[PDB]
Amino acid sequence: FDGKTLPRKSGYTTGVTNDWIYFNLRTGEIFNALGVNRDIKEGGQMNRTDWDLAFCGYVMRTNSGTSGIGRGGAADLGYGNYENWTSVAQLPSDLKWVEDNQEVYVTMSQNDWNHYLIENGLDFNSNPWFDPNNGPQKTTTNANPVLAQAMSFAGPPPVYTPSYHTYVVRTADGKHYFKIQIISWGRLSYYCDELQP
Numbered sequence: 001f002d003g004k005t006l007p008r009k010s011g012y013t014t015g016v017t018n019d020w021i022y023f024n025l026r027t028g029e030i031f032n033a034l035g036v037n038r039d040i041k042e043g044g045q046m047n048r049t050d051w052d053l054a055f056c057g058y059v060m061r062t063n064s065g066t067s068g069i070g071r072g073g074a075a076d077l078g079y080g081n082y083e084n085w086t087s088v089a090q091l092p093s094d095l096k097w098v099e100d101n102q103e104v105y106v107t108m109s110q111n112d113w114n115h116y117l118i119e120n121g122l123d124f125n126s127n128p129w130f131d132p133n134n135g136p137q138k139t140t141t142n143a144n145p146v147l148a149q150a151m152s153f154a155g156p157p158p159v160y161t162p163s164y165h166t167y168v169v170r171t172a173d174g175k176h177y178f179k180i181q182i183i184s185w186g187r188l189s190y191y192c193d194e195l196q197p
């Protein structure tokens with residue numbers, strides 16, 4: 001595969017629900033590349049603009065809306081044709097830009113689920129983490145509802161399939177545009193390249 005992968009095992013299998021690998025798409029910097037919360041812990045990203053895109057497994061976060069203070073966002077350029085998007089001039093005039101909100105689901109780690117029961121005095125016997133036919137508990141987080149479409153859900157039982165859409169991520173400064181396409185997914189394969197003005 002001639003494209004990009006994340007530097008490590010990402011998301012709930014680490015034991016942490018909000019396990020985010022942060023990319024500064026303009027500078028090439030990567031945060032939490034070595035391990036979880038190693039450079040930036042959940043909530044510690046909201047007031048930094050030195051990141052543009054973060055991944056928690058295949059789920060993506062931009063520096064916008066509820067995830068951060070920046071001028072970012074995401075938009076959907078439709079099925080395929082990744083190599084064909086080269087220029088900001090090609091973007092539709094009426095393109096719908098969407099900022100991050102707190103309505104996107106990530107899988108809860110088994111350990112976070114357990115703490116959630118202890119903290120709320122809930123009986124483990126009537127609160128299983130893992131549904132034998134529906135898989136693990138999920139919870140909402142700050143993420144991008146447009147980029148969440150990069151992996152289509154069908155179920156139960158849940159099965160995830162790439163949409164193969166090209167998406168476009170606006171950077172934290174609001175003046176740079178990165179096309180992105182998720183090819184496969186705990187190892188993630190994708191393409192991400194800057195569009196020309």
Ligand SMILES: O=C(O)CCC(CCC(=O)O)C(=O)O
Nearest residue numbers: 017108112116137138139140
């Ligand atoms: O600790 C949290 O993230 C909250 C845990 C809760 C769990 C509730 C559920 O999944 O039914 C939630 O989803 O917000």
